[PDB]
RNA sequence: GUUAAGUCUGGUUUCCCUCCAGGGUAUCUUGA
């Protein structure tokens, strides 16, 4: 198996320096082919905090987080505060599969405490204004990946794709 | 003929589950819609019929029309408590249908999920359904060979599409459940219910003032007895597919949307059920 | 001489539109057209019957008008915009048993307006059950389109 | 879809109503109908919209063209509910009515051949079969429904609740043709079981609204500033009326226990309006927490950006009858007794009244007013009172009201059955003994001008005197 | 379905044929006796009885001597006497209408479920997205015949594949739960 | 398909001709009548009792007075003159009627059929496997002629072989069933 | 003669200008792709019934026609199905006109009156007939024609 | 509305001097969809001088010139005298669409002078003789272009496009 | 303070089909 980071899709930021591993191994398994986004993952029951983005367990089945399931290590400032998981890719959630998975993996989740200081209330978060999906781009597909502007004409399905499929639910607090 | 009309009421007292309901309430209903036809000419009315009350009772001596029209909702409310008194569940001819449909898809390689869920608050499916339309003007989504309530296989998908689709986007959406130039991947049954608590059928009422009304002038109650569900009543189906991807987006949305509406009119909270249990019986 | 489905529906969805003054009258009639059709066949031909003669709350100025206008040219259906819609309706359904010959005239004259008869006609209608549910769901489906066609919706 | 809010209200007396029109029934028992609490609060919106929309425009709106407005919101035949509401009740669960016994065969045989008229009558906890042929049997029924005392010599101190026990408490029977042993047995019972089930009131019922929204309306045209008036009319509906029957004579009143909320900025302000009332401790505070919503809502940081919006239609005066808040003549008090309250108010809405004889002191005026104010009056002179522009001596002219000449309002004020009260009740709480009376008035469309000054005068007469 | 009084056993619903049914049965077993080696004389023996009671409509698993079929359709029947097999192999009774009458009777006993497309914006019904389906009921029993010329592969057909079938899916809508069905062969289970 | 009026007898289908059939019939019978030592006096005579009774429509079997067939065309039969025996044997009425009505009567028995071609993985209809298809009914009759010249095979065809040929596959579409038919030799069935 | 052939392009080129929408022109193309075989098997009175259903007739559509019959900058408004009824309707109407089976004049002062609508109706009974011959290679001409000159949708 | 520099398909090898941006500004009109070129043009009624390639318009509809409507600026110093346009990006004849039309399009063109020397008669040019093929990708779809002969597995299917979507006409003098 | 009586209302309105597939492959001089 391999070790799999997955980098959180929010309207936020905060994924620069986290990784010891940023284009990954050989491949990561989220694909961009020309139809969008492949073989995105989708965690429910965890909500992201939009500051110190961070997958905190509030038990409402309800919540949902959508984000990249990457190849690499994060930075080995971390494992305190991850999760890290052995799944034999059956019990992955994903979307769009283009592809086959190495039917067990190493996730590694950016966890968080679940903060029993102050409740947890949620409120569903979207992605709209695209002055806000102009620079997602920017940030987790051009590190992310290379294929951005080499042969990428299409980047307006991403952009819609991500203005769409990605959604999630954050504490807000 | 009329003797099999004058006598109807005892049967459906009297049989309870074994009347056909369809039927019972169809032919009730040209009772119903000739009160006053049948309520005259020294009929043949036993000393147990049910209809010979109104004999008796005189709601009006005044008018002899509106003693008539008083009657005849007296008796519309006496058949909605008759139908939701006698006619009772009895689940083990659904028990078996399901089991044997269950070992029939296990013996064509499908991904099973059973799924029991029980009725929380009086629920409504199929209003617009015929069963009780020509008495109360307003139905209930029935099988007449079954014999039961249902809820549609067809509203179900509907409903776990549209959450699927509203989390999932509406292109994961058509890839699990197709679109109209392929295939879905998923396949539900319909939902019939398995076991009440003491009822399945239980009146209710819908008294609209000022529904498409102008002003305080016109305000006028119109009230509408009509049949819902009981509360507790547990429904169970199947949800059967080969590609066990498919089965992720079941598992999750299925305790999500049910906790909303499945049937009419919740709005203001009536169609509400709650997940009993789920099943998976993977067949790869 | 014997005129088809369609063309006994045009005779006869003539005399009724030409009988509904209120043109939210017309609008109500259009909506039975296009539901009873299947309610028919849901409830069957007899329950749905008796219902639409129920709903018409008959036995008013309401039942004279009706049996005018089976010869007046000038009878005008009045009441609420709904039981007219009903009465409008019934006179279609009517129209039909009378032109076919599946009953007489006077008879179902009679068996409408009071009581000892109503019950004879329900037992005359299931006699001729067979008679009637092979070939009334083409009249009336003609009704249904010459209704959604000629009448605007509400 | 999401919560909005989630607020913990309580009844008091209520008096809902099902299919049985009772609290409870053979099947179930539903001391609370969200159905009602969505019809009332949409309400509360078309009247709370024709006070804003009148004390800034001087218009009044259709209800229908309302409801188109709002149809963003409350949903119609061409739009879902943008909310959805939900009643939880403590101990909601199977509470049926089941009458095991009630042993009435010698009624029955002493009934046969002689149509007689039969009564029923809570006699110290024993009810009397008093047949109208010079005869009474005490009938020894069980039931699972336990009518405590209070509840009896409620409804029997009570003149209004001793009123429409009438339709419930008779049947007349006519037994001179043959007639069985086995019929009768159950005519009977059905009588018995309707007079019992009418003493079902709870009182302090205590449930818990929620609202959901559905995020999917988000911002469409005007949907945030729409749904903040419908949760302002919301607060305002639990201030000033309850649910069930007879909301506009004290029952079903509600009281804010515990208001809380999940999506700030479309609630906090609602919130903090509500949680005001968490607190109340005298009288004359009451007063100005009504007035501070009842004039915010027109006169606040955000009112209304909508009225212009072509949607809407103004009213036809002599033929559209629209009702909205004075906002004026209200009149606060304090009670702490809330049963005798509640049996007090028929004193001051009756004709012969002497809670009434004692503040108009006259008759010919006593029925005027209670026609224009207290909903309708049973008649068979007066109406030199009501005509719209005539000889003024109190000032209960009305719109269209001509003096002796064919109109609209030449009998919809006289005869239609159906009018709710102008002159309303309330018994509002606050969680400690606090227990204040509200009575106001709605301001209604067909009043050509009313002397508020007057007026007032008899509210504030009619509301310490009712206590 | 049925309403009937008078009758021991209740029954919700009632298995039902006429007689042009039985004589298209007859026709197929009749031509395929002539057309093959393989003709099947309990059937044949069992429509026939059936069939000399024609013009009249009867019952052969049970003691009704009258019911309202589908609401409709008041008919008097007479029963057949117990000699008759097992046809369906089930606990239900089997009238045999005359055609003039079985022709409604069986042409109002299929199901109609009205359905419905939702817009999505409003959750409120789409314009022009309402429309009716017939279905036919649970447990209707259609007869048909598979006839096969003479080859090998024929007979590895009829003797390994004919055998391991036993469900199928026919017709359309597999998505809600339709169009399940199961072939018993008359040379195995009559 | 018909729907009887004033007709106490109750038949839910008849069989239908016309006189242009019949006379072309005629005209096979006169031809063959002289280019063999073979006549047909009674089928003759029978066709002639029929067509002397042109210009009206009329039935032979039963007594109908009047139906409605293939549900849109009301005719007005005439019995035929003192009950003329049959000329097929099934007990079912046959209705000769004018050439003009019967032209769209024949047009409304023929079975139009929509098929379509479904794609084998997918489940999804084949982009251009759709297709309307028009058979002749089950229980239709034709009529015709086989003629043989002299020799001795001819005996052998005519005393061997065309006694033993009761079913015939005719037509395609065989594997839908279709063409399975039965040839009724006219010496020995009338 | 084939003259049917050449009447149906003028009816065609009518129809394809006034469906400015190219939704209407897609659908369109399918109603003449089904109702052609519906009149064959069905007949021209039922199919007519089902067209005039769909067609949602009213003074204002219905004066989309009219002018549509004589200029040539008509455009058919309505819904996508419901003017790709109306259009068919206009391709029925204009060959009854154009072959004289009924009267222009009879025609206009009757998809107008409201009242006389139903007596057009009558009248297109009573040749149920022969329309339903006369107008065969027509309607097997614009079928061909839009299924050549539009794209499926 | 946005810029657009047509080039003329020749032969000949001068193309590269009509402009210095070669690329425009974030989008490449004619795209490369591995299916072939798609949003080409093609324009009726004009003709391709042999030298120096520049449209002399005729009054021929069966004359075409096959190019690419290449996005951007013609440097602002070429085709500052020639045939230019504003069209509503509809009237644009654009053929194998395939993509978004930007709803208007301000177009300049090698146009030559109507050449009043000779009585031009046409001649038609079938590109074949794959030298100028292998010339042409290097020359432009590798100067002009920035998504070619950098990804492309396929160097010459690409390139085989050429032969059956750009044969103009030339008038040979 | 007492007597008696309840009365009125009793389902309406929209949506009735939309889209694709409309045939494909094989067979086409002999005597005078």
């Known amino acids: 198996s391999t070790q799999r980071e997955y980098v959180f899709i929010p309207i936020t930021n905060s994924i620069t320096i986290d990784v010891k591993i940023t284009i990954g191994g050989s491949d990561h398994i989220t694909n961009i082919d020309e139809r969008g986004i492949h073989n995105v993952l989708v965690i429910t029951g965890y909500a992201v905090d939009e500051k110190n983005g961070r997958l905190v367990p509030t038990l409402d089945p309800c919540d949902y987080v959508k984000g990249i399931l990457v190849a690499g290590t994060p930075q080995q400032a971390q494992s305190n505060d991850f999760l890290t998981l052995k799944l034999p890719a059956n019990k992955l959630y994903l979307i769009r599969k283009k592809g086959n998975i190495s039917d067990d993996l190493k996730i590694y989740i950016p966890y968080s405490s679940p903060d029993a200081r102050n409740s947890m209330k949620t409120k569903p978060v979207s992605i709209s204004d695209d002055t806000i999906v102009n620079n997602i781009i920017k940030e987790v597909f051009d590190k992310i990946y290379n294929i951005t502007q080499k042969e990428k004409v299409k980047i307006e399905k991403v952009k819609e794709d991500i203005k769409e499929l990605f959604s999630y639910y954050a504490l807000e607090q | 003929a009329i003797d099999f009309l004058v006598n109807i009421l005892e049967l459906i007292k009297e049989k309870q589950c074994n009347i056909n309901l369809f039927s019972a309430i169809s032919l009730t209903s040209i009772v119903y819609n000739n009160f006053g036809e049948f309520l005259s000419n020294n009929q043949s009315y036993s000393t147990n019929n049910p209809l010979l009350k109104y004999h008796i009772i005189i709601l009006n001596d005044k008018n002899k029309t509106k003693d008539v029209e008083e009657k005849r909702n007296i008796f519309k409310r006496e058949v909605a408590e008759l139908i939701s008194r006698n006619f009772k569940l009895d689940g083990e001819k659904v028990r078996n249908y399901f089991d044997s449909l269950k070992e029939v898809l296990k013996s064509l390689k499908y991904t099973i999920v059973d799924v029991e869920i029980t009725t929380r608050t009086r629920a409504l499916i199929g209003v617009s359904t015929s069963l009780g339309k020509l008495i109360f003007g307003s139905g209930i989504s029935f099988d007449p060979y079954m014999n039961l309530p249902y809820i549609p296989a067809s509203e179900i998908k509907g409903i776990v599409r549209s959450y699927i689709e509203g989390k999932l986007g509406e292109q994961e959406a058509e890839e699990i459940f197709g679109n109209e130039e392929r295939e879905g991947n998923v396949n539900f049954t319909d939902a019939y219910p398995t076991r009440s608590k003491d009822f399945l059928f239980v009146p209710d009422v819908i008294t609209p003032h000022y529904n498409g009304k102008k002003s305080e002038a016109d305000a006028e109650p119109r009230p509408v007895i009509h049949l819902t569900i009981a509360p507790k009543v547990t429904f169970r189906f199947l949800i059967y597919y080969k590609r066990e991807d498919v089965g992720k987006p079941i598992c999750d949305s299925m305790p999500i949307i049910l906790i909303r509406g499945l049937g009419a009119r919740s709005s203001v909270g009536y169609s509400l059920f709650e997940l009993r249990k789920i099943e998976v019986i993977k067949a790869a | 001489l014997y005129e088809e489905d369609y063309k006994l529906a045009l005779e006869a969805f003539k005399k009724v539109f030409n009988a509904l003054t209120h043109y939210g009258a017309k609008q109500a009639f259009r909506s039975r057209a296009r539901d009873l059709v299947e309610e028919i066949y849901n409830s069957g031909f007899i329950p749905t019957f008796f219902y639409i003669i129920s709903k018409a709350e008959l036995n008013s100025d309401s039942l004279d008008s009706l049996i005018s206008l089976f010869s007046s040219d000038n009878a005008i259906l009045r009441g609420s915009d709904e039981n007219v819609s009903y009465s409008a309706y019934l006179f279609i359904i009517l129209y039909y048993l009378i032109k076919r010959g599946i009953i007489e005239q006077k008879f179902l004259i009679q068996a409408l307006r009071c009581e000892k008869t109503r019950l004879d006609l329900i037992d005359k209608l299931y006699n001729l059950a067979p008679i009637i549910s092979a070939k009334i769901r083409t009249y009336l489906l003609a009704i249904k389109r010459l209704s959604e066609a000629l009448i605007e919706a509400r | 879809e999401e919560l909005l809010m989630s607020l913990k209200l309580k009844a008091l007396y209520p008096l809902t109503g099902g299919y049985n029109r009772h609290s409870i029934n053979p099947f179930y028992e539903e001391l609370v109908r969200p159905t009602e609490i969505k019809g009332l609060w949409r309400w509360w919106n078309r009247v709370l919209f024709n006070t804003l929309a009148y004390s800034t425009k001087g218009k009044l709106y259709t209800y229908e063209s309302i409801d188109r407005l709002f149809e963003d919101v409350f949903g119609s035949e061409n739009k879902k509910s943008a909310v959805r509401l939900e009643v939880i009740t403590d101990e909601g669960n199977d509470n049926r009515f089941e009458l095991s016994y009630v042993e009435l065969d010698k009624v029955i045989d002493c009934l046969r051949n002689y149509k007689r008229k039969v009564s029923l009558d809570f006699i110290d906890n024993t009810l009397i079969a008093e047949i109208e042929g010079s005869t009474k049997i005490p009938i020894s029924f069980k039931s699972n429904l336990d009518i405590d005392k209070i509840i009896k010599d409620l409804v029997h101190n009570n003149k209004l609740l001793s009123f429409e026990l009438l339709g419930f408490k008779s049947v007349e029977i006519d037994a001179t043709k043959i007639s069985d042993k086995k019929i009768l047995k159950e005519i009977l019972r059905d009588l018995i079981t309707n007079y019992l089930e009418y003493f079902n009131i709870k009182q302090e019922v205590t449930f818990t609204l929620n609202i959901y929204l559905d995020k999917s309306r988000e911002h469409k045209q005007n949907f945030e500033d729409k749904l903040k008036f419908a949760l302002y009319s919301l607060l305002v509906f639990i201030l000033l009326g309850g649910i069930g029957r007879k909301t506009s004579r004290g029952f079903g009143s509600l009281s804010i226990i515990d208001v809380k909320c999940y999506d700030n900025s479309i609630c906090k302000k609602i919130e903090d309006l509500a949680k005001n009332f968490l607190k109340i401790s005298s009288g004359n505070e009451l007063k100005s927490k009504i007035e501070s919503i009842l004039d915010c809502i027109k006169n606040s940081c955000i009112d209304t950006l909508y009225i212009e919006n072509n949607i809407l239609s103004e009213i036809d005066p002599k033929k559209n009858v629209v009702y909205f808040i004075n906002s004026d003549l209200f009149e606060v008090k304090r009670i702490n007794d809330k049963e005798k309250v509640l049996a007090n108010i028929y004193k001051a809405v009756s004709s012969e009244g002497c809670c009434i004889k004692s503040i108009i002191t006259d008759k010919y005026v006593r029925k005027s007013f209670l026609i224009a104010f207290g909903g309708y009056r049973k008649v068979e002179f007066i109406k030199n009172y009501l005509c719209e522009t005539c000889e003024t001596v109190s000032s209960f002219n009305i719109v269209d009201f001509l003096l002796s000449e064919g109109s609209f309002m030449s009998d919809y004020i006289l005869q239609y059955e159906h009018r709710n009260s102008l002159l309303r009740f309330k018994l509002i709480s606050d969680n400690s003994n606090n227990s204040y009376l509200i009575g106001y008035i709605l301001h209604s469309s067909y009043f050509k001008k009313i002397d508020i000054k007057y007026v007032r005068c008899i509210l504030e007469k009619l509301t310490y005197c009712v206590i | ?190």
């Open chain 5, 1 to 190: 379905r049925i309403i009937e009084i008078d009758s021991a056993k209740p029954y919700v619903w009632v298995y039902v044929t006429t007689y042009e049914l039985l004589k298209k049965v007859k026709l197929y077993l009749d031509s395929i006796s002539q057309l093959s080696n393989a003709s099947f004389s309990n059937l044949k023996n069992k429509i026939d009885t059936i069939l000399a009671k024609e013009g009249k409509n009867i019952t052969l698993d049970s003691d009704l001597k009258s019911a309202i079929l589908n609401e409709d359709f008041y008919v008097e029947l007479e029963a057949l006497n117990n000699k008759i097999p097992s046809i369906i192999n089930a606990g239900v009774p089997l009238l045999v209408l005359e055609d003039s009458i079985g022709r409604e009777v069986i042409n109002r006993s299929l199901i109609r479920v009205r359905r419905i497309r939702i817009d999505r914006d409003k959750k409120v019904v789409e314009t022009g997205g309402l429309w009716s389906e017939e279905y036919v009921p649970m447990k209707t029993i259609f007869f048909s015949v598979l006839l096969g010329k003479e080859s090998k592969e024929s007979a590895i057909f009829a003797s390994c594949i004919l055998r391991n079938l036993r469900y199928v899916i026919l017709g359309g809508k597999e998505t809600i739960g339709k169009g399940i069905v199961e072939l018993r062969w008359v040379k195995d289970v009559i």
